[PDB]
Amino acid sequence: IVEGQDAEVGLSPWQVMLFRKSPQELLCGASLISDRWVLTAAHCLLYPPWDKNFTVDDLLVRIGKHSRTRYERKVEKISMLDKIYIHPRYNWKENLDRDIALLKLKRPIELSDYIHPVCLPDKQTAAKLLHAGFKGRVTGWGNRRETWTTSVAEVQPSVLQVVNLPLVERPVCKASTRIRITDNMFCAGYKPGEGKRGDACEGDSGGPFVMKSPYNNRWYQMGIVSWGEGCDRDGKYGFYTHVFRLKKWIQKVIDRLGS
Template sequence: MPLALDNQDMLGSYRSKVLRVKLGITTLWTAREVISVKKIITHVKYIEWNNDNDIALLLLFKPIKLSMLKTPICLPPVGNFSIKDWTTCFVIGWSTTGEIRHPEVLQKVEMELVEWKRCKKQIWSLTKNMLCAGYEEGGRNACMGDSGGPLVCKTLKNYFWYQVGIVSWGIGCTERGVPAAYALVSNYVNWIETETAKAGKPYVRKAQLRNKDKM
């Protein structure tokens, strides 16, 4: 049922009150740290029928204390995205697998990025805010339970890990010749900067670049 903007705000407020973020875990039912969510920031131009602008931010009640199991990941640069700039990509999540319906251990699988024009021929509702990954022969990809999870890659230049995509949707899970669609994070870095600044917890791209230079 379509919701008016005020009702959507109330629904988001309710969800934030019951949502919890578990940190530093690789086993599903073990949580070293749990933080409540203060606010869910959704993209105002999200389109439900094709999942365009399928991205949201979580504002937590307190900062995350970083450790060996809790480290930040880089965001990709703003601008034209080319799959030729990236290597060694993985999708990570808790999804159903062929052998285990609900795995307790965090799963990962190496992925191949797919050229946008080629993917568009297979997924007609694909937009420029989406990225595709998968294998022509099928058999490996994100599935139910992975939604909202990261697609991470390294670059050919510095080998840092970047989150290039967010698991969004697909036709089946591992269908032959049909890659899965991911939200293209590079299209939203400016949006992330704007929304985090509004929330009083700004993500600053230049600070990320400075931190990388120190590493």
């Protein structure tokens, strides 16, 4: 996260962390949607250009964390995976279209003050809240700079970072990049000279983009951090997988072809 802030403790209890087994690295972010399913971006698992094609034996999930590296005995829960589900029409060759994947935990997690699910949106919420100008929130342990330092200061944060970002009008998104957009993605960030800054950055992928409902005070997950042209660049914006647009496949996998 760039131009972020240190997150309070238990600010995002649904925040998960994909950790590579060997090397032991932070891979992406992810969110907890129930006691046994996790939601990430499909490019975090399958991405042929880098040769990356992980399986359940290639990683673990760390939940309840706040510090980016330390094993936090009193809160952290480490879990393995049983099955990985990547969208069949996920497109990594052209524009990361349908960049979504579901991960099923090998054993149900025990919820707590630091481990709690986010809600997925419904027609009502998706419609009323998904309007340009409105602010959502991004969280992660991803870089705090684009430029992997050789001067100034440090990139990697110590604890979970948070930043709030406004949804922008689709035309502005389309005009901002020379890449074929899709209805399966949205974009957010401040316009140049708008006064503020902030953006996701390497290591934040799969992280959640959430919004708090004034109608029932719950947190709904609207997007999944996906891709961008640099981090916190003027005139550039961040692109997020549109979660509601794909809630049917989510349901198709969990409710019938999953168990």
